[PDB]
Chain A
């Protein structure tokens, strides 16, 4: 793209905390399957 400029880092690849995002997506799915959703 138009930007390629020096190092916006604090974005590496080594997670070490994969279960934390599992807790994130588990909370997301439990709010997704709640009694109230108010979709569409």
Chain B
């Protein structure tokens, strides 16, 4: 009784309550009803939504799917059967929900990205078109410039428009991003398998080399076309200024934004082991190598990989060959990291010898940042500082000395740094509940009892990283649900605050709930900055 501590959403909704609360504050209530059925069921057609909502019809379901397609929140997938009857299929899209999730952090980095022209153009030129792209989805140039009348300064948007798509974010629209990840591989796995005629078996398959290597070949130019492309860029008219093609519409890319967001965690690691000026020159050397970086995990091994151990072993080896053989990212020489002498070379040698796995692997004298060999150290250096910040530093020393060896015994922790049985065995019970101990007992009896048995403490990875990730997701889902609950005491205050755009009790009501509505976003940004590290490999 007296459920005021919010217990009723404990065991009803993890991992979809976030997706339902991000769209309920943005796209009404009818879109939450269909996005709570796309996540909870999987693939289902239009009429399958109609016979499952119990409260919407075909006039209501098909109206909301356009509003979700505009924000690329629903993946299209048209398919057919062996007998015919081609119909349409819909997936839930998590990239569009992440676009709705950040939505101001996108216009935090894109403002502080340009050069010397500062605080005369980043208030209404770029900050009003980027939020229009994020809000209204796919935008072209000719439909946007009709909103302004008597366009005297009509080429001022074009200079900031060719500059923004030069290095990233703006991209050609989703002719590929509505198609799912798995069917893009499955249709490619079959259309280069059915054209090979009858031939010799040669251990009865053999094409599970050949054809799928062929598949890998024409995976490579499928992802590469939504990147830096010369079809929209480097258009030179006659006796005129350089411009890009304004006819086709364009959207934003959540692939260069994430690798530009990883740089903040790289700088946060750079605050450790070195000072500030050397961290600043590593910062500018990292910012010069942003838009060509190997991204957070490609769709090649996202799905369809049936765990072929040779292929899974060789995929992380060929990524090293992608990292070593770049069209210019490896060239982190002196003439490239000082403009955009020997003292910065000495600081760069200190970066080479800093012993965290960055700016390593340098034989000739030109340096490279090992993105692939850094990610466990990135995901572990921030994992230890959360148990230390929240639970305690003694628990952090313990959870580090579980990993200092492999499968520490009973009487080995109390030999190190602290006495026995006072808070050594007390904070173990405070860490089994977070998937960070993973006890494993072996007995000498024949029925696997607990009295005649010994305990074995091995820190099993990929269970501590996922439980904290689901914890952070459900804290985010908590934080937006309480925000839309206190809005119900302002339906008669904020809607009525439109006819004029003193009753001093409203000074403690209207201008008191405002900072109460600001300090939840102020910490939601920090929740976002702390959650990202567990989804960047």
Given a CB threshold of 8 Å, the question of whether A touches B is answered with yes
Listed in ascending order, the chain A residues whose CB lies under 8 Å from chain B are 1-2, 6-11, 13, 15, 17-18, 20-28, 30-32, 34, 36-40
* Given A10-B389, A11-B523, A37-B28, also A18-B518 (CB < 8 A): yes
Distance between Cα atoms of A24 and B106 in the complex (Å):
10
Which residues of B from 16 to 58 have beta carbons under 8 Å from A?
A: 25-31
Asked whether B519 is an interface residue with its Cβ less than 8 Å from the other chain, the reply is yes
Tell me the count of chain B residues lying within 8 A, CB to CB, of chain A. 36
Judging by beta carbons under 8 Å apart, are A38 and B103 in contact?
A: no
Judging by beta carbons under 8 Å apart, are B63 and A21 in contact?
A: no
For the complex formed, measure the closest distance between the CB of A1 and the CB atoms of chain B, giving whole angstroms: 5
Distance between Cα atoms of A13 and B131 in the complex (Å):
28
Judging by beta carbons under 8 Å apart, are A20 and B525 in contact?
A: yes
* Residue ID in chain A nearest B64 by CB atoms: A38
Q: Chain A residues near B28: list those with CB within 8 A.
A: 37-40
For the complex formed, measure the closest distance between the CB of A26 and the CB atoms of chain B, giving whole angstroms: 8
Provide 13 A-B residue pairs closer than 8 Å at the C-beta atoms, listed in order of the A residue.
A1-B4, A9-B389, A20-B521, A21-B518, A23-B107, A23-B131, A25-B521, A27-B104, A30-B135, A38-B31, A39-B29, A39-B30, A40-B29
* Residue ID in chain A nearest B514 by CB atoms: A25
- Known: A21-B104, A25-B521; 17 extra A-B contacts, CB below 8 A, are A6-B390, A10-B523, A10-B526, A15-B522, A17-B525, A23-B107, A24-B104, A27-B103, A27-B104, A30-B131, A31-B27, A31-B135, A36-B27, A37-B27, A37-B67, A38-B31, A39-B29
Distance between Cα atoms of A15 and B516 in the complex (Å):
12
Distance between Cα atoms of A21 and B525 in the complex (Å):
9
Q: Chain B residues near A11: list those with CB within 8 A.
A: 523
Q: Chain B residues near A40: list those with CB within 8 A.
A: 28-30
* Residue ID in chain A nearest B4 by CB atoms: A1
Asked whether B392 is an interface residue with its Cβ less than 8 Å from the other chain, the reply is yes
Pick the contact of B390: A8, A20, A36, A37 (CB < 8 A): A8
Asked whether B70 is an interface residue with its Cβ less than 8 Å from the other chain, the reply is yes
Secondary structure at the B interface, as helix, strand, loop or mixed, is helix
* Residue ID in chain B nearest A17 by CB atoms: B522
Asked whether B517 is an interface residue with its Cβ less than 8 Å from the other chain, the reply is yes
Asked whether B230 is an interface residue with its Cβ less than 8 Å from the other chain, the reply is no
* Residue ID in chain A nearest B521 by CB atoms: A21
Asked whether B5 is an interface residue with its Cβ less than 8 Å from the other chain, the reply is yes
Judging by beta carbons under 8 Å apart, are B518 and A38 in contact?
A: no
Asked whether B486 is an interface residue with its Cβ less than 8 Å from the other chain, the reply is no
For the complex formed, measure the closest distance between the CB of B239 and the CB atoms of chain A, giving whole angstroms: 40
For the complex formed, measure the closest distance between the CB of A10 and the CB atoms of chain B, giving whole angstroms: 6
Judging by beta carbons under 8 Å apart, are B26 and A21 in contact?
A: no
Distance between Cα atoms of A34 and B25 in the complex (Å):
13
For the complex formed, measure the closest distance between the CB of B186 and the CB atoms of chain A, giving whole angstroms: 32
Asked whether B513 is an interface residue with its Cβ less than 8 Å from the other chain, the reply is no
For the complex formed, measure the closest distance between the CB of A14 and the CB atoms of chain B, giving whole angstroms: 9
* Residue ID in chain A nearest B526 by CB atoms: A10
Distance between Cα atoms of A23 and B522 in the complex (Å):
11
Asked whether B391 is an interface residue with its Cβ less than 8 Å from the other chain, the reply is yes
Q: Chain B residues near A9: list those with CB within 8 A.
A: 389-390
Distance between Cα atoms of A24 and B523 in the complex (Å):
12
Pick the contact of A24: B31, B103, B136, B390 (CB < 8 A): B103
Judging by beta carbons under 8 Å apart, are A23 and B519 in contact?
A: no
For the complex formed, measure the closest distance between the CB of A38 and the CB atoms of chain B, giving whole angstroms: 4
* Residue ID in chain A nearest B31 by CB atoms: A38
Asked whether B461 is an interface residue with its Cβ less than 8 Å from the other chain, the reply is no
